[PDB]
Amino acid sequence: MVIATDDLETTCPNCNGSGREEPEPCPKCLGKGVILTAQGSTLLHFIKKHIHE
Amino acid sequence: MVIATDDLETTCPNCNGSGREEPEPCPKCLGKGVILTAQGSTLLHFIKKHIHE
Amino acid sequence: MVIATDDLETTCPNCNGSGREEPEPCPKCLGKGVILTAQGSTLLHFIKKHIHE
Amino acid sequence: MVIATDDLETTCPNCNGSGREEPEPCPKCLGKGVILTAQGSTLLHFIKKHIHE
Amino acid sequence: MVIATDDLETTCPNCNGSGREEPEPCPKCLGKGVILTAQGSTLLHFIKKHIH
Amino acid sequence: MVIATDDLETTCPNCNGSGREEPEPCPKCLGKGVILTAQGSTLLHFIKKHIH
Amino acid sequence: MVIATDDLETTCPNCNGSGREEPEPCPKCLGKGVILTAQGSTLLHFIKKHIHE
Amino acid sequence: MVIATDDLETTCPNCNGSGREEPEPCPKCLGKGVILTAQGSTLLHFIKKHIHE
Amino acid sequence: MVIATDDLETTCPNCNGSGREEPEPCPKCLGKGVILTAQGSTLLHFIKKHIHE
Amino acid sequence: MVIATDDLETTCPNCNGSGREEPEPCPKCLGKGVILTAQGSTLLHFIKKHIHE
Amino acid sequence: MVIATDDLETTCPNCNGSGREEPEPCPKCLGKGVILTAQGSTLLHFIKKHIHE
Amino acid sequence: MVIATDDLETTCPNCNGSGREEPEPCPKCLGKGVILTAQGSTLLHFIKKHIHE
Ligand SMILES: [Mg+2]
Ligand SMILES: [Mg+2]
Ligand SMILES: [Mg+2]
Ligand SMILES: [Mg+2]
Ligand SMILES: [Zn+2]
Ligand SMILES: [Zn+2]
Ligand SMILES: [Zn+2]
Ligand SMILES: [Zn+2]
Ligand SMILES: [Zn+2]
Ligand SMILES: [Zn+2]
Ligand SMILES: [Zn+2]
Ligand SMILES: [Zn+2]
Ligand SMILES: [Zn+2]
Ligand SMILES: [Zn+2]
Ligand SMILES: [Zn+2]
Ligand SMILES: [Zn+2]
């Protein structure tokens, strides 16, 4: 596909994808275990802005 | 355009697009008359995950 | 219980519950690992229609 | 099924399902063409109460 | 004011404002005790339509 | 009614109300077939801002 | 009706309906005043899961 | 226009519209720089009450 | 408790907590009967900013 | 980048990006200062439809 | 930190943290596997109350 | 106050607060110009989990 999951987000380098920084959620990915790429950021920012929610 | 509607969703095979399994909504598409493609699924999963809402 | 979880949803036969079709989310269940039954669809459609979000 | 759509909602008596009272939407069903039954009201009230959203 | 509360909603005729039909919520107002006026309905429909 | 639906929104001139630009939704009204008036925009902006 | 309010929830034993624990809200029902039954939990879990919102 | 923006909200007295109270947001307007009029408060209450969300 | 309810909100000075200014909602607390403290404003602004809704 | 921001939206021709038609929000972009392209419209319509918001 | 996850929630005493009471979700934690502390209940109630959503 | 804005979020080191990486939004702060501290991440994760909407 033109836009795959790996084109949108990548494994968070702080927690290595666990989403944790025990005993708290990893602050770099907020527990998701992934961070956004530029393309993922661009799409997410557009959506949030026009739907707000 | 790079991503058209037909790249995101296609006619549901169970209701042939009516979104209905009278007198109830079609269980496969939840009343939408369409089902997602792999590309549509990938994009929707990404958005819901990061916006949560 | 008049309506149990298995009256509302059932394991997705394609990913067998993992919600995955590596490296993407499973297109059938949108990564949830389950598909709706007719009863689950009737209730969810009603709720969404009258609440919306 | 245990709970069918007709157990949850019925045709709005003020517009007969058109959802309209020209040139405005029908005030009794808010344009949906349907009103709730006692069962529908009971379930929806419970869901909105515990999710609000 | 131009549009006051009573211009938007009015006491539910079924429960008289209790929002109840013991031991269940009133089916006509969904437990709110009030129903929409034509003006209230017009405004609410517009908002939901464009905000969802 | 102080504010009617026609005071809030009007027919989208691009799709002439269809909401479509087959095989895609009309980019101007997002498939609604209507666009906002000044009054509708004033109210919607207010609500969105304070509720989100 | 097949599913009545009392089938979904019952009065809270920590606050007995009040929902308060002056000066704070009751933690057991989060100021709701009631606690879900198994059937209420099952339905609410299902709805939240599929609507997220 | 029967209802203009100034009929719904007015510049906040405390922050004079900046929406700030360094280094924090202004507590009277919640950082918005405006406060509601009676009419705005009336409409917003009605909307939140019927849409909640 | 490091942060109690009275640390986040206080009774409204205009309606004395009733949340009413018959026949309308109190324009200062939007019918809540309370107003935010600085701490409450800072927390609410942060949450709404990163979730939005 | 397969889809850039300029591929999704463009400066509003009425307010030239200010989002204002003083003293009111611009009616063409609802104060956002931008309007959707066909591609942005296609994507937003899809998202709202399958999430609703 | 001032307010740690442990200060906000604790392991559900009923399901011992799995969030399950097979084949259903645990009715005490609603499938979350944790319950709220007094501090957690206070913050959550404040946020729900003022975001209404 | 016990928890100040800077206890919750800090300037994004990628865009230094602009929230931009022209001609796109900054991928590290998603255009907000700030990133979360450990405490902010802990609070947000909590609210989202127990409200997620
Ligand atoms: Mg919902
Ligand atoms: Mg809303
Ligand atoms: Mg929220
Ligand atoms: Mg959304
Ligand atoms: Zn991480
Ligand atoms: Zn179908
Ligand atoms: Zn699957
Ligand atoms: Zn009707
Ligand atoms: Zn009633
Ligand atoms: Zn159009
Ligand atoms: Zn209680
Ligand atoms: Zn202010
Ligand atoms: Zn007040
Ligand atoms: Zn404009
Ligand atoms: Zn449990
Ligand atoms: Zn940045």
Residue numbers in the entry:
A (entry chain D), G (entry chain J), K (entry chain A): 1 to 53
B (entry chain E), D (entry chain K), L (entry chain B): 101 to 153
C (entry chain L), H (entry chain I), I (entry chain C), J (entry chain F): 201 to 253
E (entry chain H): 101 to 152
F (entry chain G): 1 to 52
Sentences from the paper on this structure:
In Bacillus subtilis tryptophan biosynthesis is regulated by two proteins, the trp RNA-binding attenuation protein (TRAP) and Anti-TRAP (AT), which are involved in sensing levels of free tryptophan and uncharged tryptophanyl transfer RNA (tRNATrp), respectively. AT antagonises TRAP action by binding to tryptophan-activated TRAP and preventing its interaction with the leader region of the trp mRNA. Binding of zinc ion is essential for formation of AT oligomers and for its function. Here, we report two crystal structures of Bacillus licheniformis AT, which shares 66% sequence identity with B. subtilis AT.
The asymmetric unit of the high-pH form contains four AT dodecamers (48 subunits), all with identical architecture. The high-pH dodecamer has the same 23 point group symmetry as the low-pH dodecamer, but the orientation of trimers within the oligomer is inverted so that residues buried in the low-pH oligomer become exposed in the high-pH oligomer and vice versa. In contrast to the low-pH form, the zinc-binding domains of the high-pH dodecamer participate in trimer–trimer interactions while their C-terminal helical regions are buried inside the dodecamer. In contrast to the low-pH form, the high-pH dodecamer does not contain any significant internal cavities and has a more compact structure. Trimer–trimer contacts include a number of hydrogen bonds, formed between pairs of residues Thr5–Glu24, Glu24–Thr42, Lys48–His52, Ile51–Glu53 and Cys26–Ser41. There are also hydrophobic interactions between pairs of residues Leu30–Leu36, Leu30–Leu44. The high-pH form contains Mg2+ ions, coordinated by the C-terminal carboxyl groups of three subunits. From the crystal structure alone it is not clear whether the formation of the 12-mer is induced by these ions although it is likely that they stabilise the conformation of His52, which is located in a disallowed region of the Ramachandran plot. Zinc-binding segments (residues 9–36) of the high-pH dodecamer are more flexible than the core area of the trimer despite their involvement in trimer–trimer interactions. Similar analysis of the high-pH dodecamer of B. licheniformis AT resulted in the ΔGdiss value of 38.2 kcal/mol.
